[PDB]
């Protein structure tokens, strides 16, 4: 993994030693090169993982997430260079440094082989994100959003640290391979219930679970565009990856302890879709759609079948790409009219045609439209939930109907109708914005073409 | 065709009736088939002849990897990590092979249904029974292990099944 | 007023100075080369080359190997009258049940 | 190799070809619509060839060309089913689409985005072909949702029209309920059969159960606009007339009927689901014809006629006659497409007027559209030897001669009478009498494109039924023996509807005025279903979306419980701890208390 | 001139040399885990006449 880790730690001095007008060019070029290099991790084995060394390993679950992170960095660079034109050179370099540090921490998190190193890295990811939000947010509410995000994550994760050190003391190791091979059943006791609770609650807060999700609209709406892109695409996937990793040692207690979380996930999926139906803010609508999709992922992980894990992985990758694209589109609209209200700008199809096309494709991917990997993951999760019980189909159908409703509501509100008469500063779409949308959308279709790369180790 | 094994993928002998026309009207199907053979089949055949001639000049071979058998989780001692690793890898490979066996049987079933057409309920009874037996065995082997399945869990399931069978036999003999 | 504060500046349009602007940089040459490097590297290199690399990634998952092994096992078992799928994963003789 | 598979896949691929040319100078020029129409005609002939291959020896095949992915023991591959249904419906759909595209070349000449319009029509055709030829449930669902989204895009063709946007979203909503049913069926089939392909589904489901068959029925009702999910089809007239003619009425609303046809072995194995299908079809056809007989918008009348014919198809499926339903699908496609084209010609010639109260005099004003619409209405009502005779008459005979629901049979007969009634209404109010349109007469139907497209769909409305019925192999036992009065029942009820509707329409000329009846108000306002069911449930869902989930729970109580209460407690404790006057006497008294407590209570 | 180009574009080798150094360190880490090389029951075999190790 060092062949990918070291180039990021070299992106840092390159950023700090490049000229004032070349930082964006150099960062974008070398981020794309690092993504291409990280594309070689997809060649996985059918029996076991890729164990590079004692510290890092790669799997069919880690590889797509690493490729997604490395691909997401240059898009964030493009959006940031869009909205940071008047910044000073030092502060531009500091923002790029925060993005580079976040990518490095995410890579090491996804490839960490021990649970304690994984904990350290996935908690280290908070500092760059908090700095980015509370420093380069546009509105006043960025401070409150950062406080909510930080304290939700930490109040979730500290019992996880205590549980991890306790598990190391009890079993002798936190190495994932050892704990998978030497796993023993978890007896029904209060102590085991609370250990299960500590681990699962940490990752549920990271997911987020319904009832533990207010920090998500707070942070996603108030973060800058790059922060919004990284928060939805990758940082929400740390919880799912962790749950798919820790649940090895949590059996058979997961059969009985998963009921409240499954009920919360399903009902809150319905409730957050309904909330999306009545959102006066576009960023909030995108954030709540993210909440619903991650609730579906939680359902998959909790039912915990080989068909559910593949759907969970595919849905995580698809949601990352789609949510990043939606945030980018909404940010272009915001950079036009300097307001996040959905009904402020209308007729954007007659004012900007190709952006209307990008909106249409993004909305069609947001709802499960076959044969997109979004639909692949959602359908696998729905089939696994059907095998689990036969009213989950009722809940999933309701959620799909509401998802289509609010996605097309957003599309029709923003793009169709007649333009606002007094808004006369909507310049034609930039080549940079069009390229950002194309780079968001084409890999999703190629993944649709080749779907076994994002179905996880259970494939 | 020698591409696949006729025993692994059986095909009933093909019985095609001879044409027995009763009218002097020409056959548009025959005329269009002649046109198709003249215009498409001959050009594609010539192109494939050239391509195969190019392939024959650079003949090279690839091989099927052979894995020797290794001791399984039953023979492995407790917390003997190396033996457990080898046994788990072997169990995973066998699981994949069994999945592909079930796939082969299902392909047989689908092909026979399509082939027999309107008489499939009777003529495909042989392929339905093989599928029933294969699926029963595969389900008994790997039915409800979970997302974190392993050779240890499958062995525990087999032990539980053996205990149930022993108890049933004892109760029957009692 | 309560402070000596700057007025809120007017929004800056990149197309006013440079009609053929790609939206990357104020400087025309820098903006053009930013567009060129982004398009070339991203689209051509990453998309095309990574897509064909992933398409032609070697069969390290042993899907075709498993299919050939299954073909051999089915042939052998149906030739000798043995069941196609064995009843047990392990050997009951090697398994020792409690009394 | 057999040319069958090659020619079928070639038809599909050459259909997909012009979409690749949508990024070219030809797409930037004015020759793109003619290019697409020519491609569709060539595809029609190339699909006619395998139809000849089937009608000779009954050749049927499945083609699994490309393997997609293997979910352990389940293999998903790109497979096509080229059987009787596919090889018969493909040429009919291609012929209809060719005629519609020529009619649109004439009709949509003033549209700035005629090239995009033709691209969307071709994309819908491709998705419908995918749906028809799909061999497994996943590919069938691909075609399902593809035609759904293409319908959504084409209904909202004029993006500035709020009514068009509402109609498109309404169609999406009802089709999403249908998709709930579809996904239920897919999940059940995979879980209980380890397959998504028709071969293994048919093999393993010897007695198919209520849950999968009701899922299929719900999907079919949603896609075919049966009662309960019907209103989106008449509302789908917001799109341009070519869209209404090709997509909805002829080829896309028959998607649910086709889905039920494709699982006819399972439908045979079940009986309760067959009864449910029969009752749903009967109520649908009766209610939609009853609503049709009193509409003043010609497109609305034709849409309700299409809904009634779909209900008749569902009735045919419910009596275990799957092949008659397919025959009626073909015949109805022909004559309903021609009827929609005639109504569109009338609308264009009268300056975008769609009101029969403003039409009139067109019998002699527009000769060729008049004769075409008369022939289509005679075929629609089952003229004893036209294209609609070879399907509707057999359907009625099968309904009368079977062990059916008595109410379903009665409603089917009344629906046939009302079909005659609304056809008479259209003819009487659009062609007979004196003009009622504005004085500036711009009537001109002398365009070769329009004339030739209507001609091609007119030869089918007369002869295609005879050819198709005499060339397909016998797939059902005929009802040879029956009473003479039951044999003539369809004709008798058709003539009675003709006569009663003609008399009622003739009474309009009297200088007599009377306020409308309650039955008239119920029929004209669509049974009040769209009003109540589009205002009450929508209001309640949108009100709960904000009052309860958004404000009460998300913004109030989820904030009050976890984060706000903890912050309040921490602030109170912080104030309590830090609120000290800094007096050494006070905190040294505290020291004394602490020392005493440590000495006594700790041992 | 040429000096200014090198003075400005010398940062474009940092990421490539970091990739090279990462590959080298990956090789170094791999060479420390050679305690079961040609010793697994599955892949144990006899060495060819002109080779010292099975893998590196
Ligand atoms: C108050 C009403 C109430 O109890 O609502 C429960 C209900 C859970 O859903 P459910 O479907 O009713 O529960 C299924 C069974 O009743 C209960 O499940 P079971 O009977 O199968 O046994 C499993 C049970 C085992 O039972 C126990 O362990 C009981 C002993 C106490 C455990 C306390 C754990 C606390 C963990 C942190 C919670 C932070 C909040 O597991 C739990 O109790 C899980 C505790 C964590 C639940 C989710 C935490 C996040 C809540 C987000 C909204 C917060 C506002 O709602 C909540 O817990 C949150 C809303 C109410 C506060
Ligand atoms: C992939 C295409 C991505 C296009 C991105 C935008 C490109 C662009 O700027 O275009 C402007 C450019 C010129 O237009 P313009 O007037 O200069 O620009 C102004 C406006 O932008 C003009 O805007 P517009 O209104 O003309 O929009 C053009 C087009 C632009 O939008 C799109 O093309 C959207 C396509 C993505 C939809 C996302 C949701 C579904 C995800 C499915 C993923 C499948 C991946 C397959 C592999 C892909 C590998 C890249 O949008 C539409 O046509 C409306 C949406 C139609 C979607 C229909 C999908 C049904 C399901 C198809 C499943 C096929 C695979 C399974 C088949 C199984 C059975 C064999 O147009 C093109 O270059 C043509 C674009 C593509 C035409 C539609 C293709 C739909 C997808 C294929 C369906 C099957 C038909 C046969 C295809 C044979 C090849
Ligand atoms: C909860 C109930 C659930 C019921 C479920 C079952 C429903 C079954 C429905 C059956 C069909 C009903 C058709 C009429 C309803 C629509 C009337 C309407 O609005 O027309 C205006 C509309 C004209 O629109 P417009 O140009 O705006 O004119 C404005 C109006 O003039 C403005 O003037 P208006 O507003 O005065 O016009 C309406 C007025 C004038 O329309 C008529 O009189 C239509 C009469 C149609 C024929 C009925 C007698 C058929 C006799 C057949 C005898 C032979 C049988 C065969 C055997 C022969 C050998 C023995 O109609 C009435 O007053 C009642 C008509 C009958 C209603 C039936 C449903 C009853 C609902 C509950 C009771 C309500 C009673 C009080 C009414 C409300 C409060 C005041 O009429 C038409 O376009 C023609 C209508 C269709 C005529 C032919 C119908 C043939 C099929 C039905 C008869 C059965 C034939 C055999 C079938 C096969 C048997 C085996
Ligand atoms: C009718 C409607 C049909 C419309 C379809 C439109 C598409 C055209 C047809 C498909 C293209 C022809 C088939 C090409 C196909 O064969 O290639 C695919 C392969 O596609 C690529 O693998 C997709 C690449 C996806 C990854 C792109 C990464 C680029 C950077 C993006 C980073 C972000 C990703 C984050 C998550 C990883 C499938 O793999 P495979 O069939 O076997 O290839 C055969 C060759 N073999 C036999 C040697 C194997
Ligand atoms: C299985 C779960 C789903 C079950 C049904 C749930 C119903 C929930 C209703 C959806 C909530 C609506 C949220 C927002 C939707 C879009 C906004 C909206 O209200 O659009 C209104 C729009 C415009 O009305 P117009 O008539 O065109 O008037 C226009 C005049 N210029 O109308 C609509 O599209 C709303 C239609 C919703 C129908 C609700 C009831 C549907 C009937 C379901 C029960 C029947 C089941 C069928 C049984 C099948 C038998 C096998
Ligand atoms: C015996 C064990 C219990 C002892 C205490 C355990 C602590 C549990 C975790 C504590 C989290 C720390 C956050 C609370 C800090 C105190 C907040 C406070 O004082 O409330 C007032 C404060 C406003 O005043 P100031 O910002 O200080 O400035 C005012 C200017 N005139 O309210 C706020 O807006 C701050 C809110 C902070 C973020 C909101 C809390 C985040 C979520 C809390 C629960 C975590 C969920 C777990 C998942
Ligand atoms: C106020 C009420 C607060 C209720 C929530 C609980 C949080 C307060 C933490 C205080 C600890 C309360 C639970 C203590 C459980 C415990 O210590 O035992 C677990 C067990 C003890 O076993 P032994 O000591 O070895 O016994 C040997 C038997 N012969 O040790 C473990 O398994 C490690 C568990 C770590 C402690 C977990 C405590 C928290 C429980 C999970 C809740 C997660 C909340 C996440 C916050 C996000 C939403 C707010
Ligand atoms: C373009 C014109 C090129 C001009 C020369 C024509 C080339 C002809 C020679 C044939 C090419 C060689 C070839 O086809 O090899 C087979 C090759 C791979 O072999 P497989 O057995 O399928 O491997 C399994 C992959 N998992 O197959 C292919 O690449 C052809 C695939 C084309 C089929 C259509 C592409 C599908 C696109 C739709 C998107 C996905 C839809 C999802 C399907 C859902 C099914 C439930
Ligand atoms: C609150 C009570 C009702 C709860 C379910 C409905 C909730 C609201 C609507 C949800 C719509 C989406 C989900 C639809 C699920 C349909 C499931 C189904 O059809 O179940 C059939 C049921 C079980 O049949 P099964 O067990 O397969 O066969 C043995 C004989 N019972 O067989 C039976 O039940 C026998 C009766 C057959 C008729 C059932 C009609 C169901 C209509 C569903 C759509 C409604 C709109």
DSSP A373-411: HHHHHHHHHHHHHHHH-SSHHHHHHHHHHHHHHHHHHHH
Residue B159 exposed, middle or buried by CB count within 10 Å (0-12, 13-18, 19+): middle
CB D308 within 8 A of CB D227: no
Other beta carbons within 10 Å of C3: 5
Radius of gyration of chain A from Cα atoms? Answer: 21
* A23 closest CA partner among A93, A98, A88: A93
Q: What is the spatial distance between Cα A403 and Cα A393, in angstroms, rounded to a whole number?
A: 15
* Tokens found for residue E56: 């590196």
Characterize B11-42 residue by residue with b for buried, 16 or more Cβ atoms within 10 angstroms of its Cβ, and e for exposed. Answer: eeeeeeeeeeeeeeeeeebeebbeebeeeeee
CB A221 within 8 A of CB A156: no
Report yes or no: A426 at the C interface, CB cutoff 8 Å. no
Tell me the three-class secondary structure of D518-580, residue by residue: HHHHHHHCHHHHHHHHHHHHHHHHHHHHHHHHHHHHHHHHHHHHHHHHHHHHHHHHHHHHHCC
Report yes or no: A398 at the D interface, CB cutoff 8 Å. yes
DSSP A132: H
CA triplet C65, D196, A259: central angle to 5 degrees?
A: 95
Q: What is the spatial distance between Cα A317 and Cα A295, in angstroms, rounded to a whole number?
A: 15
Shortest-distance ligand to the CA of residue A373:
2
> DSSP states of B12-25 as a string?
PPP--PPP---SSS
Question: At which residue do the structure tokens 């090659």 appear?
Answer: D6
User: How many Cα atoms are found within 13 Å in the side-chain-facing hemisphere of D423?
Assistant: 29
Say what the resolution is, in angstroms. Answer: 2.9
> DSSP states of D197-234 as a string?
BHHHHHHH-SS--HHHHHHHHHHHHHHHT-TTS-THHH
> Is residue A354 in contact with ligand 2, taking CB distance under 6 Å?
yes
> Is residue A194 in contact with ligand 1, taking CB distance under 6 Å?
no
CB A2 within 8 A of CB E25: yes
> DSSP states of A331-344 as a string?
HHHHHHHS--BTTT
Sign of the torsion angle spanned by Cα atoms A235, A241, A247, A253: positive
The CA A200 to ligand 1 mean position distance, Å, reads 13
Report yes or no: B92 at the C interface, CB cutoff 8 Å. no
The CA D546 to ligand 1 mean position distance, Å, reads 25
Residues whose CB falls within 8 Å of the CB of residue A80, separated by 6 or more in sequence, listed in order: A95, A96, A99, A224, A225, A226
The CA A451 to ligand 4 mean position distance, Å, reads 9
Nearest CA in chain A to B92: A47
Backbone φ and ψ for B130, nearest 5 degrees, come out as -60, -45
Residues in a beta bridge with D70: D75
Report yes or no: B147 at the A interface, CB cutoff 8 Å. yes
Radius of gyration of chain E from Cα atoms? Answer: 20
Q: Are strands D74-82 and D61-71 parallel, antiparallel or unpaired?
A: antiparallel
Report yes or no: B136 at the D interface, CB cutoff 8 Å. no
CA distance E20 to chain A (A): 7
Q: Return the SS3 of D252.
A: helix
- Chains near B with 3+ CB pairs less than 8 A apart are A, C, D, E
* Tokens found for residue A108: 């090491």
Give D-chain residues touching A347 at CB under 8 angstroms: 160
Report yes or no: D58 at the B interface, CB cutoff 8 Å. no
Among A130, A140, A155, A157, which residue has the most ligand 6 atoms within 8 Å of its CB, making it the best to mutate? A155
CB D110 within 8 A of CB D498: no
Question: At which residue do the structure tokens 């999910």 appear?
Answer: D229
CB D257 within 8 A of CB D317: yes
Q: Look at D60 and B117 and tell me if their CB atoms are within 8 Å.
A: yes
Q: What is the spatial distance between Cα A300 and Cα A305, in angstroms, rounded to a whole number?
A: 8
Shortest-distance ligand to the CA of residue D142:
2
Sign of the torsion angle spanned by Cα atoms D128, D129, D133, D134: negative
Residues in a beta bridge with A341: A281
Among A260, A271, A299, A389, which residue has the most ligand 1 atoms within 8 Å of its CB, making it the best to mutate? A260
- Testing the interface with B: which of E33, E42, E45 to mutate, by most B Cβ within 10 A? E42
Q: What is the spatial distance between Cα D255 and Cα D222, in angstroms, rounded to a whole number?
A: 10
Nearest CA in chain A to C49: A36
Q: What is the spatial distance between Cα D427 and Cα D461, in angstroms, rounded to a whole number?
A: 17
Among A285, A396, A398, A407, which residue has the most ligand 5 atoms within 8 Å of its CB, making it the best to mutate? A398
> Is residue A163 in contact with ligand 7, taking CB distance under 6 Å?
yes
Q: What is the spatial distance between Cα B21 and Cα A340, in angstroms, rounded to a whole number?
A: 76
Other beta carbons within 10 Å of B49: 10
List, in sequence order, the alpha helices (H) in D431-528.
448-459, 465-471, 484-487, 489-506, 518-524
Q: What is the spatial distance between Cα D195 and Cα D200, in angstroms, rounded to a whole number?
A: 6
CB D118 within 8 A of CB D26: no
Q: What is the spatial distance between Cα D358 and Cα D561, in angstroms, rounded to a whole number?
A: 65
Among A361, A365, A373, which residue has the most ligand 2 atoms within 8 Å of its CB, making it the best to mutate? A361
Backbone φ and ψ for A334, nearest 5 degrees, come out as -65, -40
Q: What is the spatial distance between Cα B137 and Cα D514, in angstroms, rounded to a whole number?
A: 78
Sign of the torsion angle spanned by Cα atoms D362, D364, D369, D372: positive
Distance, first Cα to last Cα, chain A: 23
Q: What is the spatial distance between Cα D425 and Cα D497, in angstroms, rounded to a whole number?
A: 11
Q: What is the spatial distance between Cα D149 and Cα D143, in angstroms, rounded to a whole number?
A: 10
Q: Return the SS3 of D136.
A: strand
CB A57 within 8 A of CB A51: yes
Q: Which atom of ligand 8 is nearest to the CA of D78?
A: 45
Q: Are strands D61-71 and A50-51 parallel, antiparallel or unpaired?
A: unpaired
CA distance B167 to chain D (A): 30
CA D236 to chain centre: 9
* Tokens found for residue D253: 């609303």
Q: What is the spatial distance between Cα D92 and Cα B109, in angstroms, rounded to a whole number?
A: 33
C-alpha distances in Å from residue D436, one per residue of B163, D339, D345, D356, D433: 90, 22, 17, 9, 9
> Is residue D221 in contact with ligand 9, taking CB distance under 6 Å?
no
Report yes or no: B85 at the E interface, CB cutoff 8 Å. no
Give C-chain residues touching B75 at CB under 8 angstroms: 94
> Is residue D541 in contact with ligand 5, taking CB distance under 6 Å?
yes
CB D105 within 8 A of CB D34: yes
The CA D224 to ligand 9 mean position distance, Å, reads 20
Task: Determine what percent of chain D falls in helix, strand and coil, rounding each to the nearest 5.
Answer: 75, 5, 20
List, in sequence order, the alpha helices (H) in B5-41.
28-36
CB D403 within 8 A of CB D376: no
User: How many Cα atoms are found within 13 Å in the side-chain-facing hemisphere of D336?
Assistant: 32
Q: Return the SS3 of A50.
A: strand
Q: Return the SS3 of D294.
A: coil
* Tokens found for residue A119: 């904990």
* Tokens found for residue A225: 């565009």
CB A267 within 8 A of CB A304: no
What's the domain range around E56? 1-56
User: Number of Cβ pairs closer than 8 Å across A and C?
Assistant: 96
Q: Look at A28 and C35 and tell me if their CB atoms are within 8 Å.
A: no
* D15 closest CA partner among D39, D31, D37: D39
Question: At which residue do the structure tokens 């000798």 appear?
Answer: C80
The CA A398 to ligand 5 mean position distance, Å, reads 13
> DSSP states of B109-137 as a string?
HHHHHHHHGGGHHHHTHHHHHHHHHHHHH
Q: Solved how?
A: cryo-EM
* Tokens found for residue A398: 């309701």
> Is residue A430 in contact with ligand 1, taking CB distance under 6 Å?
no
CA B132 to chain centre: 14
* D590 closest CA partner among D600, D601, D580, D575: D580
* D280 closest CA partner among D316, D253, D247, D249: D316
> Is residue A391 in contact with ligand 9, taking CB distance under 6 Å?
no
Please report, for chain D, how many H helices and E strands are present, in that order.
29, 2
Q: What is the spatial distance between Cα C62 and Cα B65, in angstroms, rounded to a whole number?
A: 10
Report yes or no: D56 at the B interface, CB cutoff 8 Å. yes
User: How many Cα atoms are found within 13 Å in the side-chain-facing hemisphere of A421?
Assistant: 0
CB D295 within 8 A of CB D524: yes
Q: What is the spatial distance between Cα D227 and Cα D310, in angstroms, rounded to a whole number?
A: 11
Nearest Cα residue to atom 25 of ligand 1: A257
Q: Look at B140 and C87 and tell me if their CB atoms are within 8 Å.
A: yes
> DSSP states of A69-108 as a string?
HHHHHHHHHHHHHHH-SSS-HHHHHHHHHHHHHHHHHHHH
Q: Do chain D and B touch: 3 or more Cβ pairs under 8 angstroms?
A: yes
Q: What is the spatial distance between Cα B48 and Cα A451, in angstroms, rounded to a whole number?
A: 31
Distance, first Cα to last Cα, chain C: 93
Give A-chain residues touching C22 at CB under 8 angstroms: 430-432
CA distance B117 to chain D (A): 9
Q: Look at B89 and E40 and tell me if their CB atoms are within 8 Å.
A: no
Q: Among D6, D56, D200, whose Cβ lies nearest the Cβ of B106?
A: D200
* Tokens found for residue D278: 């029969």
> Is residue D544 in contact with ligand 5, taking CB distance under 6 Å?
no
* A306 closest CA partner among D132, D159, B149: B149
Q: Among D195, D199, D204, whose Cβ lies nearest the Cβ of B114?
A: D199
CA A28 to chain centre: 21
Q: Look at B106 and D60 and tell me if their CB atoms are within 8 Å.
A: no
Q: CA dihedral in degrees (B103, B108, B109, B110; nearest 10)?
A: 90
Q: What is the spatial distance between Cα D26 and Cα B33, in angstroms, rounded to a whole number?
A: 34
Residue D60 exposed, middle or buried by CB count within 10 Å (0-12, 13-18, 19+): middle
CB D453 within 8 A of CB D100: yes
Is the preceding omega at residue A115 within 30 degrees of 0, hence cis?
no
Q: Look at B110 and D70 and tell me if their CB atoms are within 8 Å.
A: no
CB A415 within 8 A of CB A351: no
> Is residue D502 in contact with ligand 9, taking CB distance under 6 Å?
no
Q: Are strands A50-51 and D74-82 parallel, antiparallel or unpaired?
A: unpaired
Sign of the torsion angle spanned by Cα atoms A73, A74, A79, A82: positive
Report yes or no: A230 at the E interface, CB cutoff 8 Å. no
Q: What is the spatial distance between Cα D295 and Cα C15, in angstroms, rounded to a whole number?
A: 55
What's the structural domain count of chain E? 1
Report yes or no: A147 at the D interface, CB cutoff 8 Å. no
């Amino acid at each position: 993994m060092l062949k990918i880790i070291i180039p990021t730690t070299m992106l840092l001095p390159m950023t700090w030693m490049s000229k004032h007008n070349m930082i964006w060019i150099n960062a974008t070029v070398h981020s794309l090169l690092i993504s291409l290099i990280s594309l070689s991790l997809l060649n996985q084995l059918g029996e076991n993982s890729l164990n590079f060394s004692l510290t890092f390993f790669s799997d069919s679950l880690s590889a797509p997430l690493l490729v997604l992170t490395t691909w997401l960095l240059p898009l964030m660079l493009m959006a940031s260079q869009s909205h940071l034109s008047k910044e000073t050179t030092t502060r531009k370099k500091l923002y790029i440094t925060m993005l580079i540090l976040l990518q490095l921490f995410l890579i090491m998190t996804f490839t960490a082989t021990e649970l304690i190193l994984f904990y350290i890295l996935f908690e280290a990811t908070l500092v760059p994100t908090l700095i980015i939000i509370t420093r380069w947010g546009n509105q006043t509410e960025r401070l409150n959003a950062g406080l909510y995000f930080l304290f939700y994550t930490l109040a979730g994760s500290l019992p996880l640290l205590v549980a991890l050190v306790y598990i190391q003391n009890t079993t002798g190791s936190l190495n994932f391979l050892i704990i998978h091979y030497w796993s023993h059943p978890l007896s029904n006791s209060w102590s085991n219930i609370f250990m299960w609770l500590a681990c699962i609650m940490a990752f549920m807060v990271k997911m987020p679970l319904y009832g533990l999700h207010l920090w998500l609209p707070k942070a996603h709406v108030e973060a800058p565009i790059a922060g919004s892109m990284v928060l939805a695409a990758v940082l929400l996937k740390l919880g799912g990856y962790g749950m798919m990793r820790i649940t090895t040692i949590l059996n058979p207690l997961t059969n009985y302890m998963a009921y409240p979380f499954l009920m919360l996930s399903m009902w809150g999926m319905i409730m957050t879709s309904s909330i999306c139906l009545r959102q006066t803010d576009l960023k909030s609508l995108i954030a709540y759609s993210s909440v619903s999709h991650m609730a579906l992922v939680i359902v998959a992980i909790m039912i915990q079948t080989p068909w559910s894990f593949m759907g969970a992985t595919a849905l995580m990758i698809a949601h990352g790409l789609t949510s990043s694209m939606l945030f980018c589109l909404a940010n272009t609209n915001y950079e036009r009219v300097h307001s996040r209200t959905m009904i402020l700008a209308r007729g954007l199809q007659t004012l900007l045609p190709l952006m209307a096309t990008w909106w249409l494709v993004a909305s069609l991917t947001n709802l499960a439209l076959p044969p997109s990997i979004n639909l692949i993951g959602e359908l696998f999760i729905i089939t696994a939930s059907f095998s689990w019980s036969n009213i989950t189909i009722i809940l999933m159908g309701m959620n799909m109907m509401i998802t289509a409703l609010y996605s097309l509501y957003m599309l029709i509100t923003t793009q169709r109708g007649k333009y606002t008469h007094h808004i006369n500063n909507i310049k034609p779409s930039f080549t940079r914005e069009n390229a950002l949308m194309a780079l968001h959308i084409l890999p999703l279709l190629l993944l649709t073409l080749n779907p076994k790369m994002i179905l996880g180790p259970l494939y | 065709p020698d591409s696949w094994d006729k025993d692994v993928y059986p095909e009933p002998p093909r019985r095609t009736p001879a044409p027995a026309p009763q009218t002097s009207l020409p056959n548009p199907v025959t005329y269009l088939t002649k046109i198709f053979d003249l215009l498409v089949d001959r050009p594609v055949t010539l192109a494939r002849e050239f391509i195969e001639q190019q392939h024959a000049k650079n003949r090279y071979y690839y091989y099927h990897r052979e894995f020797r058998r290794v001791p399984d989780i039953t023979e492995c001692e407790e917390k003997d990590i190396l033996c457990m690793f080898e046994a788990e890898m072997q169990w995973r490979r066998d699981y994949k092979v069994d999945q592909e066996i079930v796939n082969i049987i299902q392909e047989r079933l689908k092909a026979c249904q399509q082939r027999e057409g309107e008489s499939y309920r009777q003529n495909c009874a042989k392929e339905l029974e093989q599928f029933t037996q294969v699926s029963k065995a595969f389900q008994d082997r790997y039915s409800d292990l979970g997302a974190h399945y392993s050779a240890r869990k499958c062995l525990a399931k087999q032990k539980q099944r053996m205990l149930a069978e022993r108890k049933a036999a004892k109760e029957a003999a009692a | 007023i309560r402070l000596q504060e700057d007025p809120d500046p007017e929004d800056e349009n990149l197309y006013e100075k440079n009609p053929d602007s790609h939206g990357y940089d104020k400087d025309p040459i820098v903006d053009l080369w930013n567009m060129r490097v982004v398009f070339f590297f991203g689209f051509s290199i990453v998309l095309v080359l990574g897509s064909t690399f992933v398409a032609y990634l070697p069969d390290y998952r042993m899907q075709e190997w498993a299919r050939r092994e299954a073909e051999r096992l089915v042939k052998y078992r149906e030739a000798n009258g043995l069941p196609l799928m064995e009843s047990n994963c392990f050997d009951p003789n090697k398994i020792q049940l409690p009394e | 190799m057999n040319p069958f598979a090659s020619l079928t896949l070639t038809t599909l691929t050459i259909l997909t070809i012009p979409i690749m040319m949508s990024n070219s100078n030809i797409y930037k020029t004015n020759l793109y619509p003619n290019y697409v129409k020519t491609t569709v005609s060539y595809a029609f002939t190339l699909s006619l060839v395998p139809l000849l291959m089937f009608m000779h020896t009954g050749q049927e095949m499945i083609i699994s060309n490309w393997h997609w992915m293997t979910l352990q023991t389940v293999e998903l591959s790109l497979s096509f089913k080229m059987d009787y249904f596919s090889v018969m419906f493909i040429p009919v759909a291609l012929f209809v689409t060719w005629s519609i595209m020529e009619f649109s070349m004439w009709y949509m000449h003033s549209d700035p985005f005629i090239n995009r319009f033709f691209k969307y029509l071709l994309l819908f055709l491709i998705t419908m072909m995918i749906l028809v030829t799909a061999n497994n449930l996943f590919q069938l669902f691909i075609g399902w949702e593809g035609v759904g989204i293409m319908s959504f895009l084409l209904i909202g063709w004029w993006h500035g029209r709020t009514d068009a946007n509402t109609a498109a979203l309404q169609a999406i909503l009802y089709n999403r309920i249908g998709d709930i049913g579809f996904v239920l069926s897919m999940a059940w089939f995979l879980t209980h059969s380890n397959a998504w392909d028709l071969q293994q589904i048919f093999m393993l489901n010897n007695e198919c159960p209520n849950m999968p068959l009701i899922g299929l029925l719900l999907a079919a009702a949603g896609k075919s606009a049966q009662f309960g999910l019907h209103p989106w089809l008449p509302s789908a007239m917001e799109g341009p007339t070519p869209v209404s003619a090709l997509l909805h009425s002829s080829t896309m609303v028959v998607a649910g009927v086709f889905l039920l046809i494709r699982f006819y072995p399972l439908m045979e194995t079940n009986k309760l689901v067959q009864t449910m299908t029969l009752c749903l079809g009967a109520i649908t056809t009766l209610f939609t014809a009853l609503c049709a007989i009193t509409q003043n918008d010609i497109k609305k009348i034709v849409a309700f006629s299409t809904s009634s014919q779909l209900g008749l198809m569902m009735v045919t499926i419910g009596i275990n006659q799957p092949h008659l339903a397919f025959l009626h699908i073909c015949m109805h496609a022909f004559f309903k497409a021609m009827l929609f084209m005639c109504s569109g010609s009338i609308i264009h010639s009268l300056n975008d007027e769609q009101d029969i109260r403003k039409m009139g005099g067109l019998y002699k004003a527009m000769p060729f559209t008049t004769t075409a619409l008369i022939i289509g209405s005679l075929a629609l009502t089952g003229m004893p030897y036209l294209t609609g005779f070879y399907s509707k008459d057999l359907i009625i005979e099968a309904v009368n001669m079977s062990y059916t629901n008595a109410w379903a049979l009665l409603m089917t007969l009344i629906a046939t009478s009302l079909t005659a009634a609304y056809s008479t209404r259209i003819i009487f109010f659009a062609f007979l009498g004196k003009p009622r349109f504005p004085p500036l007469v711009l009537i001109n139907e002398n365009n070769p494109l329009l004339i030739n497209s209507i001609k091609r769909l007119l030869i089918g409305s007369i002869f295609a039924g005879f050819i198709i019925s005499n060339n397909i192999p016998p797939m059902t036992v005929p009802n040879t023996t029956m009473p003479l009065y039951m044999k003539m029942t369809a004709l008798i009820v058709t003539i009675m509807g003709f006569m009663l509707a003609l008399e009622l329409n003739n009474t309009t000329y009297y200088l007599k005025f009377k306020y409308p009846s309650q039955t008239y108000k119920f029929s004209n306002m669509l049974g009040y279903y769209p009003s109540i069911m589009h205002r009450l449930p929508t209001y309640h869902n949108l009100s709960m979306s904000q009052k309860s989930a958004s404000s009460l729970l998300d913004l109030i109580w989820l904030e009050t419980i976890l984060p706000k209460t903890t912050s309040f407690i921490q602030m109170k404790m912080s104030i309590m701890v830090s609120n000290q006057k800094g007096l050494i006497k006070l905190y040294f008294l505290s020291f004394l208390i602490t020392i005493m407590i440590s000495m006594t209570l700790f041992n | 001139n040429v000096l200014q180009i090198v003075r400005d574009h010398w940062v474009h080798i940092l990421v490539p040399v970091g990739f090279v150094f990462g590959c080298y360190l990956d090789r170094r880490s791999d060479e420390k885990l050679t305690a079961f090389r040609n010793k697994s029951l599955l892949f144990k075999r006899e060495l060819r006449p002109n080779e010292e190790v099975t893998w590196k």
